[PDB]
Amino acid sequence: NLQDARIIIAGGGIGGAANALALAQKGANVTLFERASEFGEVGAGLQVGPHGARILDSWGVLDDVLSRAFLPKNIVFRDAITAEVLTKIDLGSEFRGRYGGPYFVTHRSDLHATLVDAARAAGAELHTGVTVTDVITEGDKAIVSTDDGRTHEADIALGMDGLKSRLREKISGDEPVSSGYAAYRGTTPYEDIEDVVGYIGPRCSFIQYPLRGGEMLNQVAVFESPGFKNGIENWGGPEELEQAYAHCHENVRRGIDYLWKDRWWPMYDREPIENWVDGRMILLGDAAHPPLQYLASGAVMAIEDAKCLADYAAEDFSTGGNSAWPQILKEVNTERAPRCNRILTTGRMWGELWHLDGTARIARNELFRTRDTSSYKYTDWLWGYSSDR
Amino acid sequence: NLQDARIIIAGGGIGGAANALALAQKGANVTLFERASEFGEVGAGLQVGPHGARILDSWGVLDDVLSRAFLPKNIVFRDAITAEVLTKIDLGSEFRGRYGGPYFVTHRSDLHATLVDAARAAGAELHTGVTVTDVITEGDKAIVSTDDGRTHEADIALGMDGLKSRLREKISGDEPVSSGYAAYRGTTPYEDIEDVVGYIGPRCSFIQYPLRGGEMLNQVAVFESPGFKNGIENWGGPEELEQAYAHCHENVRRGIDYLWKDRWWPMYDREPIENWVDGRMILLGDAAHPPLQYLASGAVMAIEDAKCLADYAAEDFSTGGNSAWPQILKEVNTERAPRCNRILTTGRMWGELWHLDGTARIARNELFRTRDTSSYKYTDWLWGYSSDR
Numbered sequence: 001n002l003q004d005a006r007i008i009i010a011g012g013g014i015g016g017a018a019n020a021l022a023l024a025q026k027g028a029n030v031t032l033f034e035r036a037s038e039f040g041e042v043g044a045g046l047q048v049g050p051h052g053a054r055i056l057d058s059w060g061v062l063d064d065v066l067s068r069a070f071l072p073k074n075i076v077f078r079d080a081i082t083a084e085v086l087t088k089i090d091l092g093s094e095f096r097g098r099y100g101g102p103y104f105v106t107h108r109s110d111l112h113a114t115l116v117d118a119a120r121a122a123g124a125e126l127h128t129g130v131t132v133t134d135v136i137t138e139g140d141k142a143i144v145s146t147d148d149g150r151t152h153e154a155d156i157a158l159g160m161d162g163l164k165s166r167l168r169e170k171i172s173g174d175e176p177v178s179s180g181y182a183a184y185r186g187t188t189p190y191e192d193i194e195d196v197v198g199y200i201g202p203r204c205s206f207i208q209y210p211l212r213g214g215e216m217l218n219q220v221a222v223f224e225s226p227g228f229k230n231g232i233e234n235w236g237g238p239e240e241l242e243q244a245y246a247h248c249h250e251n252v253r254r255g256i257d258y259l260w261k262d263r264w265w266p267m268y269d270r271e272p273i274e275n276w277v278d279g280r281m282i283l284l285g286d287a288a289h290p291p292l293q294y295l296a297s298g299a300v301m302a303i304e305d306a307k308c309l310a311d312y313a314a315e316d317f318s319t320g321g322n323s324a325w326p327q328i329l330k331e332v333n334t335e336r337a338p339r340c341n342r343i344l345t346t347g348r349m350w351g352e353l354w355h356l357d358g359t360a361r362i363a364r365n366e367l368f369r370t371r372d373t374s375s376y377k378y379t380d381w382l383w384g385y386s387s388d389r
Numbered sequence: 390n391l392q393d394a395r396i397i398i399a400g401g402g403i404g405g406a407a408n409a410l411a412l413a414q415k416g417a418n419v420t421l422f423e424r425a426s427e428f429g430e431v432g433a434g435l436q437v438g439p440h441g442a443r444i445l446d447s448w449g450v451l452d453d454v455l456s457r458a459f460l461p462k463n464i465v466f467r468d469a470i471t472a473e474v475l476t477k478i479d480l481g482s483e484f485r486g487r488y489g490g491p492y493f494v495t496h497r498s499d500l501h502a503t504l505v506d507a508a509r510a511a512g513a514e515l516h517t518g519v520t521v522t523d524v525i526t527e528g529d530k531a532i533v534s535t536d537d538g539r540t541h542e543a544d545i546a547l548g549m550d551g552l553k554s555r556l557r558e559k560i561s562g563d564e565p566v567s568s569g570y571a572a573y574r575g576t577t578p579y580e581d582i583e584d585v586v587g588y589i590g591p592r593c594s595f596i597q598y599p600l601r602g603g604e605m606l607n608q609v610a611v612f613e614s615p616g617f618k619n620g621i622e623n624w625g626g627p628e629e630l631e632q633a634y635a636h637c638h639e640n641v642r643r644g645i646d647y648l649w650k651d652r653w654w655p656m657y658d659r660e661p662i663e664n665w666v667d668g669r670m671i672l673l674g675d676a677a678h679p680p681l682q683y684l685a686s687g688a689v690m691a692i693e694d695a696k697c698l699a700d701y702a703a704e705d706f707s708t709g710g711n712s713a714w715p716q717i718l719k720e721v722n723t724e725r726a727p728r729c730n731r732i733l734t735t736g737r738m739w740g741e742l743w744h745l746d747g748t749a750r751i752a753r754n755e756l757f758r759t760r761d762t763s764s765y766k767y768t769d770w771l772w773g774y775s776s777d778r
């Protein structure tokens with residue numbers, strides 16, 4: 001366990017929250033600083049596969065999350081031009097047995113609030129409206145600076161400040177890499193859908209799934225922005241959606257009418273990095289490994305990061321104390337980097353596979369149609385992973 | 390049978406020769422005019438699948454052709470970058486039973502000479518060094534003009550003057566369509582090869598097969614020419630081969646050193662046309678349906694054209710006489726156009742599937758690897774076709 005240890009977390013997204021929970025359940029003294037004036041997430045959906053669900057269950061929050069979630073029966077891929085089914089991934093009891101948990105979908109806002117609340121319950125001290133301005137290591141401590149002029153000492157600091165992480169600059173000068181694709185979301189108060197459906201087409205895709213016991217439908221449009229390639233600064237705006245989808249089936253074109261249009265998510269990732277550690281600071285979540293969303297595992301990775309850190313630290317700290325932290329951070333980095341970096345790189349290829357045109361589309365469609373649906377070789381690496389040693 | 394009928398064939402390629410044979414075996418009076426001063430073909434290989442082999446057997450020339458041919462055990466597709474096997478088509482006894490004949494490979498020069506000789510044996514009158522300059526229909530005759538000033542009358546004329554057919558201009562003003570790919574051939578006096586091997590890579594492919602009882606190896610390089618896209622008039626020259634293949638496996642790069650470099654075949658086809666008939670002239674072979682070579686069926690199609698024409702004419706002429714010819718030509722066109730035009734259009738897609746790059750290549754490779762190799766659904770339409778009614 002971790003009662004002698006103090007950890008400061010910079011950032012209160014799903015990642016920071018999950019880490020606060022995991023670490024506080026082990027008895028650690030956790031202080032989290034979130035820049036925003038309140039905790040909150042987008043009132044739209046995310047998908048959480050069993051690689052995340054198993055971990056939420058281990059923290060005792062799964063039943064509660066599920067009470068407000070939806071359990072899809074399948075993931076269904078369809079051709080975006082014809083609407084024909086290409087293949088399904090069955091999410092039933094055989095899937096759940098193999099992977100240790102359900103594939104579920106829920107609101108981001110609810111998952112985030114549930115983690116925050118549980119982190120509070122377990123003894124984590126969460127502070128909104130506080131920005132971390134610097135983190136250094138001096139001797140056997142992380143020294144964290146905040147925007148109110150104060151400095152705080154801890155045994156380690158977690159850099160969990162997202163895709164646009166400034167703390168990542170301590171380790172890497174890289175910039176986000178544009179995919180050239182943008183994402184729009186919508187929910188609409190709810191032919192019928194009880195699955196995650198993904199329509200995959202030339203330079204575009206469209207995803208639908210139910211939320212909250214089937215009352216609402218989550219919709220997401222991902223498309224190649226011509227403005228990006230043309231050098232537009234604020235690229236992927238909604239003027240682009242009609243042409244992006246014009247070649248698709250009616251089922252998909254109808255969907256576009258529900259998207260929220262006042263806001264969108266231009267899709268960027270970063271090139272994978274092996275080293276996440278700077279003294280007694282470690283980058284986790286998107287600050288370390290921000291993906292493109294095709295594997296629906298960014299938030300999941302962050303949740304995995306939390307389980308790994310807390311587990312490995314509870315294992316090592318009880319025998320080595322606060323002197324052990326640099327070895328613990330190294331071990332966590334060693335475990336997590338190959339996993340997450342494969343998700344980054346594979347995710348790029350997987351999205352490219354969605355968006356193929358011409359003959360490449362014809363080959364892709366046939367590949368998906370003819371597969372051995374009883375094999376798990378395309379998904380075990382993702383859903384069957386665990387950090388447990 | 391056809392003894393009261395006279396047919397003039399314009400062109401003495403594999404097509405014209407096959408037609409002369411088929412028609413002469415039915416008792417027709419055949420006159421063929423070939424522009425070149427002698428009969429002859431390239432001393433390199435072609436492939437003849439059972440859709441052609443069955444027909445050669447029906448004319449009694451297969452055993453003889455095979456005595457000088459090679460019988461590959463498989464068609465083997467390999468990745469051109471890694472050299473790894475993607476899939477095989479087994480050409481064994483189950484294949485031969487299903488399709489009515491062997492898949493064989495031989496020299497073009499030998500197949501052509503064997504057809505000519507058999508056409509001579511069966512009573513066809515072949516004339517070298519004579520160019521057909523015009524063909525018209527007047528009343529119930531085709532009137533054919535030749536370059537020595539003479540005109541010749543026949544019941545029908547076959548326009549078999551190849552890819553650059555001038556007689557096709559009577560029906561269509563289309564021009565050949567560049568694929569942007571060029572082909573090089575080589576033979577070399579013969580790790581070992583007893584199959585047709587096709588290495589398929591990004592913007593390039595490389596084909597190898599044995600000839601003449603395994604003594605010689607036929608090699609063919611097909612690649613995307615950057616000069617074509619850059620507007621070079623005589624595009625696809627040998628200065629382009631080193632860069633075209635630089636990214637490929639050694640097995641393929643070694644092969645390029647054997648190609649004959651003083652001559653190449655820039656690959657063109659034509660858009661499919663439904664109507665091949667102008668009065669009492671019909672376009673057959675490449676004049677009607679010149680393909681890109683990925684289905685290895687251009688000469689085969691021409692041989693099929695000959696069987697169909699001779700069969701349908703022998704069926705109808707015995708009851709309707711020379712008055713029947715326009716109906717016979719219509720029926721032949723009706724049968725052959727959908728078949729051949731599917732080969733044209735599918736052949737384009739099939740070559741595109743060979744030459745995919747990036748993620749599309751990854752999907753293609755997996756498609757080929759995981760297929761049900763006992764299914765014949767991808768090949769029955771090609772190899773199991775017959776004109777017999």
Ligand SMILES: Cc1cc2nc3c(=O)[nH]c(=O)nc-3n(C[C@H](O)[C@H](O)[C@H](O)COP(=O)(O)OP(=O)(O)OC[C@H]3O[C@@H](n4cnc5c(N)ncnc54)[C@H](O)[C@@H]3O)c2cc1C
Pocket residue numbers: 010011012013014015016033034035036045046047048130131132133160161162163166183265284285286287290291293296297298299300301302
């Ligand atoms: C369209 C889309 C769909 C997606 N769908 C899925 C999905 O279905 N499933 C999935 O698992 N993932 C998905 N993801 C990925 C997922 O949203 C992210 O990977 C994840 O939310 C990252 O969590 P995080 O806590 O690391 O970073 P963020 O969520 O970015 O949180 C960072 C937090 O740090 C705060 N902050 C920043 N700087 C400072 C500072 N200096 N001091 C203090 N606080 C600071 C920010 O205000 C913010 O709250 C999706 C992403 C997109 C864009």
Ligand SMILES: Cc1cc2nc3c(=O)[nH]c(=O)nc-3n(C[C@H](O)[C@H](O)[C@H](O)COP(=O)(O)OP(=O)(O)OC[C@H]3O[C@@H](n4cnc5c(N)ncnc54)[C@H](O)[C@@H]3O)c2cc1C
Pocket residue numbers: 399400401402403404405422423424425434435436437519520521522549550551552555572654673674675676679680682685686687688689690691
């Ligand atoms: C690289 C490559 C590889 C190929 N491989 C294969 C394969 O493995 N299998 C396969 O089945 N096919 C293959 N083909 C296709 C095949 O070569 C052709 O489809 C076929 O030879 C066409 O035969 P043809 O008689 O219609 O036309 P051609 O062979 O073009 O014959 C036309 C003849 O007409 C003569 N002529 C022209 N104008 C006149 C005139 N006015 N008067 C008199 N005579 C005239 C010409 O001199 C010529 O001999 C390949 C083609 C290429 C380019």
Ligand SMILES: O=C(O)c1cccc(O)c1
Pocket residue numbers: 045046047183207220222293294295296
């Ligand atoms: O919001 C999602 O669930 C999602 C999942 C995958 C890709 C994407 O753009 C979005």
Ligand SMILES: O=C(O)c1cccc(O)c1
Pocket residue numbers: 434435436572596609611682683684685
């Ligand atoms: O010469 C061949 O056998 C051949 C077959 C297919 C494609 C190609 O370019 C050549």
Ligand SMILES: [Cl-]
Pocket residue numbers: 291292293294295296297298299
């Ligand atoms: Cl994601």
Ligand SMILES: [Cl-]
Pocket residue numbers: 680681682683684685686687688
């Ligand atoms: Cl051909």
